[PDB]
């Protein structure tokens, strides 16, 4: 089907545009966000979560795609706010990490030039217009994504126990496993009223240019042992004329120029 890509190997990120032309547009993600360079906007609509405090359904799977571990959400998770009151449906969660220690940079977005050891991204689309997130992407519909940045703390973050167990379960390339019950709202930072928003894109091919990003100012903390499980995930990579298996590490796109884009900031 779709042509294989990598971050720094074969068809690396500098060359994605040769096959996926949108990857060369001026509205690409991720970016760095500096607070003093943003525009505070009181007009922004407070974030509204519907169904996020409910238990995750039994058919919620995590999946090792070789580029990330993806969670395919099943509940009717609805979200709105920021630049509009239009309701989106949250359908996918992906993770980006480095070498998985407290001092490693693995996030895609950064704040104040600081990268983080882990980033979680939750993807959403307009369920009225489209039947699935993939269809929305294929049709260039309006997309919304939320970025959650992580720091390593001293203690085990119990809200993530089910997720972490799931990542352990899919170390093997391509593997899928059902997730133990979890609560999606509990995966977000303590307070969500402080956030940034900008016009951007998917951070990997096809790099679709129609994503409004919400990036939370506050971080989520997990322990060192929780972060460690991500670097046990396995992938396949073409290295020269040989196809090899390796640990999945540094699975993030480098940062992009803003090109006149404005970053908006909530007011609290």
Domain boundaries, the chain: 1-268
Query: Number of C-alpha atoms within 13 angstroms, CB side, residue 152?
Result: 19
In sequence order, the 6+-apart residues with CB closer than 8 A to the CB of 193 are: 46, 47, 266, 268
In sequence order, the 6+-apart residues with CB closer than 8 A to the CB of 84 are: 45
Concatenating the DSSP letter of every residue in 115-132 gives --SEEEEEEEE-TTT-SS
CB neighbours of residue 114 within 10 Å: 11
1-268 domain in CATH 3.10.200.10?
yes
Asked how this structure was determined, the answer is: X-ray
* Alpha-carbon dihedral 224, 112, 251, 150, rounded to 10 degrees: 30
Distance between CA atoms of residues 23 and 9, nearest Å: 17
* H helix runs in the chain, sequence order: 16-19, 133-138, 161-169, 224-228
Concatenating the DSSP letter of every residue in 204-219 gives STT--S-EEEEEESS-
CB neighbours of residue 194 within 10 Å: 14
Resolution of the solved structure (Å): 2.0
Beta bridge partners of 176: 63
Residues 158-182 as b or e (16 or more Cβ within 10 Å = b): ebbebbbebbebbbeeeeebebeeb
**Contact yes or no for 196/211 (Cβ under 8 A):** no
Evaluated on CA atoms 85, 78, 136, 235, the torsion sign reads positive
CB neighbours of residue 61 within 10 Å: 15
């Amino acid at each position: 089907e779709e042509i294989g890509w990598s971050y720094t190997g074969a068809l690396n990120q500098k060359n994605w545009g040769k096959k996926y032309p949108t990857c060369n547009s001026p509205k690409q993600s991720p970016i760095n966000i500096d607070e003093d360079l943003t525009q505070v906007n009181v007009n922004l609509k407070k974030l509204k979560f519907q169904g996020w405090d409910k238990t995750s359904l039994e058919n919620t799977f995590i999946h090792n795609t070789g580029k990330t571990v993806e969670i395919n959400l099943t509940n009717d998770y609805r979200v709105s706010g920021g630049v509009s009151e239009m309701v989106f449906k949250a359908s996918k969660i992906t993770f980006h990490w480095g070498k998985c220690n407290m001092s490693s940079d693995g996030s895609e977005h950064s704040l104040e030039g600081q990268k983080f050891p882990l980033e979680m991204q939750i993807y959403c689309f307009d369920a009225d217009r489209f039947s699935s997130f993939e269809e929305a992407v294929k049709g260039k519909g309006k997309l919304r994504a939320l970025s959650i940045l992580f720091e390593v703390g001293t203690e085990e973050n119990l809200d993530f126990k089910a997720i972490i167990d799931g990542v352990e379960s899919v170390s093997r390339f391509g593997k899928q496993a059902a997730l133990d019950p979890f609560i999606l709202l509990n995966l977000l930072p303590n307070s969500t009223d402080k956030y940034y928003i900008y016009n951007g894109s998917l951070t990997s091919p096809p790099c679709t240019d129609t994503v409004d990003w919400i990036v939370f100012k506050d971080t989520v903390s997990i322990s060192e042992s929780q972060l460690a499980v991500f670097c046990e995930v396995l992938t396949m990579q073409q290295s020269g004329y040989v196809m090899l298996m390796d640990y999945l590490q540094n699975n993030f796109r480098e940062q992009q120029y803003k090109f006149s884009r404005q970053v908006f900031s909530s007011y609290t």
